[PDB]
């Protein structure tokens, strides 16, 4: 009768259903007075709320506060954070291959065989990449069998790390659990299996944690100031002066000089000395943890103009062309990059239709420029020039009547 939870339930269902149900009745007692109404509202909607959870942090801060679904999302987030598992857990769920920037179809709904060519193409697409996952999702604690719904040929086998949210809820008929995703995943191995005469792809997945404040900016300063208060006095007077003169108006000139192939054929020795000194001072205190930062960009950074027909992302052909052109291709900048760790919308880049989501690996060089009180800029972290980025996934969201793109990337060393 007493069912002990292992790391993985493998294919046991009864041992999983009973454990999940018991946890459900245990959690039901501890819930607050409006948590039940939030759960019921999710139960009746179950679709729009997930999309809102994914795309809410990209609106204006006053828009975010004025959003009608903000309270329910916050309450469900609190409920998920209420229950943290003491030990890791292996989970199962079905994910469409299109999530991993694979536009081709592995197989249709009623097809059985998976060809070798599709498997090889998917393996080539997925390897050596990082994919970010967000939103509320239903998760299965056991590998599905003949009594379960299997909508997509791709089955994901993921291992939830320490201190992850968990919430077994009863949808008035059965038992199910709900989680919130704020983490990045990597596919290690894919193998072809057979379930009831249809082939399937089983992917082993792992979780790579990242620091992402989303719309919470007070916590952002709370960490940035603590990180880079000691960075101020470490800078030598010459390097400190060069750093100051950067955003005292010289950053624009330096960036224009650096974009136009200056330091190669038409250089300026003073500019080269300044950039060398500031990049040396930047390397003093690199970021010691994986970090997620945001940056609003325009068509000029991606080889387009504000009048380009492809820039109008309200027509699906434009999105298809942009994804086929940019997904799976490297992006390089020859100048310095300043990004905002907060995802809130601001009047500075209101009209821009492209949003960048830069992922900073642990130990990568950087500097929190927002540590000086003399600069009115908010939430800025700087990077060295000559950078390289890899485009992983491209998504589109509606901001009123304007369709804007979210781009995820990765800065290799």
């Amino acid at each position: 009768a007493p069912i002990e939870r292992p790391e993985d339930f493998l294919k046991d269902k009864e041992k999983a259903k009973e454990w999940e149900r018991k946890e459900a009745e245990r959690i039901e007692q501890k819930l607050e007075r409006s948590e039940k109404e939030a759960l019921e509202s999710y139960k009746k909607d179950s679709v729009e709320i997930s999309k809102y959870s994914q795309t809410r942090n990209y609106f204006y801060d006053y828009q975010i506060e004025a959003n009608s679904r903000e309270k329910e999302y916050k309450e469900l987030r609190n409920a998920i954070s209420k229950n943290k598992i003491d030990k890791p857990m292996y989970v199962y769920y079905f994910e469409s291959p299109e999530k991993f920037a694979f536009n081709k179809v592995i197989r249709t709904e009623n097809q059985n065989e998976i060809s070798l060519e599709k498997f090889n193409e998917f393996k080539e697409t997925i390897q050596n990449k990082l994919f970010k996952q967000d939103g509320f999702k239903d998760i299965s604690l056991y590998e599905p069998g003949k009594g379960d719904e299997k909508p997509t040929p791709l089955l994901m086998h993921l291992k939830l790390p320490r201190n992850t949210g968990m919430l077994p809820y009863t949808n008035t008929n059965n038992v199910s659990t709900l989680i919130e995703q704020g983490y990045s995943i990597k596919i290690d191995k894919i193998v072809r299996i057979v379930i009831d005469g249809k082939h399937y792809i089983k992917a082993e997945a792992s979780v790579v944690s990242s620091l992402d404040f989303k719309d919470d900016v007070s916590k952002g300063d709370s960490w940035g100031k603590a990180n880079y208060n000691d960075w101020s006095n470490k800078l030598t007077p010459n390097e400190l002066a060069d750093v100051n003169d950067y955003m005292r108006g010289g950053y624009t000139a330096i960036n224009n000089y650096l974009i136009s192939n200056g330091p190669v054929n038409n250089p300026n020795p003073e500019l080269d000395s300044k950039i060398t000194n500031i990049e040396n001072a930047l390397k003093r205190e690199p970021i010691p943890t994986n970090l997620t930062v945001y940056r609003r960009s325009g068509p000029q950074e991606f080889g387009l103009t504000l009048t380009s027909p492809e820039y109008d992302f309200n027509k699906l052909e434009n999105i298809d062309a942009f994804k086929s052109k940019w997904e799976g291709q490297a992006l390089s900048y020859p100048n310095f990059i300043s990004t905002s760790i907060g995802s809130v919308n601001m009047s500075a880049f209101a009209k821009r239709k492209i949003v960048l989501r830069i992922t900073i690996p642990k130990g990568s060089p950087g500097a929190y420029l927002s540590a000086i009180p003399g600069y009115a800029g908010e939430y800025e972290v700087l990077l060295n020039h000559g950078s390289k980025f890899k485009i992983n996934k491209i998504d589109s969201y509606k901001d009123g009547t304007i369709t804007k793109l979210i781009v995820d990337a990765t800065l290799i060393p």
Binding site: T108, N110, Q111, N112, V194, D196, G197, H199
Partner: protein, 82 residues
């Protein structure tokens, strides 16, 4: 084509015109398979259980059941019945 109606994991045309199981996947029947010891199966494309016994068409043909059931009860038209 690859249209499936009764959700038995066997396409309608395969059930209507003949099929066989190899590597646990239904494949279109070819006349040269008889030399290697294979069999030709036809079943109801509108019923998951053609013969009425508990096991579906795919299970009976693939052999994915009790391995003590006589081998003649593997084609969908003969019911496994004690």
């Amino acid at each position: 084509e690859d249209l499936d109606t009764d959700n038995d994991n066997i396409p309608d045309s395969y059930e209507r015109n003949g099929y066989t199981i190899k590597d646990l996947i239904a494949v279109k029947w070819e006349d040269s398979f008889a030399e290697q010891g294979y069999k030709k199966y036809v079943s109801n494309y509108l019923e998951s259980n053609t013969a009425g016994d508990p096991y579906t068409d795919y299970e009976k043909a693939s052999g994915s059941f009790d391995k003590a059931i006589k081998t003649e009860a593997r084609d969908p038209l003969v019911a496994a019945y004690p």
